[model samples]
Target: SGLVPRGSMIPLWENQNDIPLFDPANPFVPHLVPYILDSSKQLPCIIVFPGGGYTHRAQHESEPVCLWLNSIGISAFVLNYRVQPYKHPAPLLDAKRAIRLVRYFSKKLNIDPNRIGVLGFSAGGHLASLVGTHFDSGDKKNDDPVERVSCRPDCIVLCYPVISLAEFAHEGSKKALLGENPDPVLVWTLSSHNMVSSKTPPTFLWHTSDDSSVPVENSLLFAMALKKHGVPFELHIFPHGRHGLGLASDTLYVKEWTKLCEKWFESIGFIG
Candidate 1:
């Protein structure tokens, strides 16, 4: 409710209508699951964005993922950012709208606006990174107090993000961000990798050695930028887990990445 009808719209993605728990016709709903830890305040929430190469929604990543966050004592908001036909600003607009919506009703939702973070995988990782990098004040003049609020993230988690435009961008995301006939300058401007600035949020990134869909350079390059700007960050590259390995099975160390992420979040005093 508060998340949309501000200056944007609610989150949406390709085919998000299918996996509704009991099979609800539409899955564009903005969902949040919270875990109150200190009682002194609401928990910081992480917005989960699953990868689908800009063509569809990845609900599998959200339901289980949010359920996991709830089990661990955090609020998780599953987002179905605009995809395909909508493209670029569509997804970004959804992100901004979603973050603010959470902020708007932080109290009722048991979340802290200041502690909101984002976690994304692959193409969705790029979208998450874009939200992290482009966060800014939406409209400062509106009488609506929400308008004065910024959409910046407290932190971000990128799993094998397709970070660059000059070199790589998951092909589909590149085309989605910049139509097939895009200008070189526009490429850099729309790219999450090229958009990183001092304002970029602290981040956590991981990738596998042999995965080729969205090369390691994607994370490496972004990590280098973070280092240059003195932003806090950590990276991991598994010896085997490969690409599109969602949640990385427990049999493998990749599953430990989430644990590592929790530690990272805790280290920064982001979680209880």
Candidate 2:
């Protein structure tokens, strides 16, 4: 038998009040859907965030991507974070908690806690980048085991993410997450590229050169920030494809992203 529970969902927060925008009647509580692999040894795990412009989670980017990770000898968790009616730290909180949850249950989950990573698409990419840049080593004083463990992902993979809230920003995602006429400071704060530091984890990024929705500049901006901080990263820019090309299965050239990403993971020692 595997360490991970089969077909089980794990809620991130034990106390309802700890969850932002708590509504008992609503089924919007954040949780993780595990797609763990059966293995004799502990495997690295990635938490997946599917982009829907901060309004909804895209189906294409969720389970399929997790399955893909599983196929690569990695365990995966699909994070169902809050969006739209939820704002700012809500999604970020969920993302952080998901990482912490995996780490907290590393034994039962049969995952390497230090090898936890994150991957996202579109707005989800922004969230993943934010987590990479804005994580902490956990609150030592916190009573909750999840909160007592670090939320930082060891590495990150971003796909056509929304990186800037100030320049070349995706208006829909900005509005959904930050509301209308948000403060200038808040915009700069939430811009994932602006938050990078030396402490940020290694990153892998890819985007279509002609993506009209979330501009290709988003990935470029993040990669540049990573470079400035001397963070190890890999960047791929395909010549043609639209935004939200999850897996890019139908595309001729863009589909190679999965293979390239797998290689990057191996190079980074995320895959064994």
Candidate 3:
């Protein structure tokens, strides 16, 4: 955590006070913690979403990832997106709003608005894929200036994501995201790979060839869709690693994803 200040947290919604309060014990508040570098040059940023099986945010995937990003001189934010019992568009909404807010404050934050991206792992990666595939140009006439900014990320990074609801799906993640008895139509509809188009941003993906929890084919399915749309992408399927290996510290080989990813960021003009 030394790389970042005990920085600022900004609520995703404005005029929140107007809404009636929910449970004081467990309010569904979504926010962002900025990890800005102290430099004159504007930087690219990734809004980090830690994987939690759509149930809870994994601590290993949160701050450590942000710190690594900061060390590479790329700015980042830890997005505490609303999860379980909240479901589907709630997490998606939080993610979309986070991107817009970053863009809205890009000038003041000293970051490149166009270079902002999303990075997610496991279930969190599912959210990133959704934001990448399902996004819009800013509503220019929206009353809130933040709403007037686009939520689409410039690029994306998904690590062992639950991309398919039908094939190779992470059942826990799917249930948490879409509910226990989700409609069949909605099941295929929420499959991120099924949603890809030319508008989807350039993406980078990595998965273990032997991943048991989320399946390697999840990345495969999504990447194939990206290629079908002629969307730029890079994928790495390491031969061996277990599920949710945050930073892959225990496995020496898999840590290469981070280095390759930062290089991808530079290639995309996110970092110098």
Candidate 4:
């Protein structure tokens, strides 16, 4: 944890009082208004969603990852999206709001509105994919102005995302994403990998071959789809290590992932 010693968390919500007090909501927005690291540069911002079977969030999902991102000169916003008992679209709505908030106050936040990207882990990865792929098109007409914004991420980074909704899919993912009553066909649609079109963002994806929770195939299948569409994507497949390796030490393959990601950002011209 030397990279980040766990500082106090910042909020994504602008008005702390706006957050309801008694009812305790899902998708807790840490009202953090980010400032630019460099005065002259319009930096790209990443909204990081940490996974917790949809019932809770991995601490790394909320804090340390933000620290890591900021340390690398990228403004990072940590998301505490909705989980179990909340129902679908709870987390997705929070994610959409966070992205809008980042864009809505681009002047104060000092990040480029057009360069916003989403990064998600596990279930969070699925949410990121939803945001990345389904931003505009949906089962119905675009209702929300926020949704009206290009949901196409400038980039997407997924860590062991839940890509398929088959019985073979990750159990917690199947239940949390679609509920116990998911329609068979709808289940596949929510799998998200099936939704990847040519419009999806340039993605930075990675997963461990040892990930049994969601299976590495989640990344594989999705990456293949992006490639088949002629979309820009980069993937790093580590031979070992299992689930939930968020910035952990001695985790050989993942420890080096940040460099690859930073370099990738540069390659895409998101950063210099």
**Best by the TM-score measure:** 2
lDDT comparing candidate 3 with the true structure: 0.87
Q: Against the true structure, what is each candidate's TM-score? A: 0.84, 0.97, 0.94, 0.84
Which segments of model 1 are wrong by more than 4 Å? 1-41
Over the stretch 126-207, how does candidate 1's per-residue lDDT look in tens digits?
A: 8788888888866788665655677888899998887887685678778876678878876787667667788888899988
In model 4, the runs with Cα more than 4 Å from the true position are: 1-38, 137-148
lDDT of 2 by residue, 1-272 (tens): 45555457778887777886666676787888889998889899999999999999999999999989998999998999998788887899899889988999998878999999999999999999999988999998987767899999999999999999989999999999999989999899899899999999999999999999999999999999999999989999999898888999889999999999999999999996
Task: Please report how far candidate 3 places residue 77 from its true position, in Å.
Answer: 0.1
lDDT of each residue in 101-150, candidate 3, tens digit only: 99999988888998999999999999899999889888999888888999
Candidate closest to the true structure, highest lDDT: 2
Pairs in steric clash, model 3: none
Clashes of each: 1, 0, 0, 7
Candidate 1 lDDT:
0.73
lDDT of model 2 at position 267: 97
TM-score of candidate 3 versus the correct structure, residues matched by position = 0.94
In model 1, how large is the Cα lDDT of residue 28?
A: 45
The residue pairs found clashing in candidate 2 are none
lDDT, each prediction: 0.73, 0.91, 0.87, 0.73
Which 10-residue window in model 3 sums to the lowest lDDT? Answer: 15-24
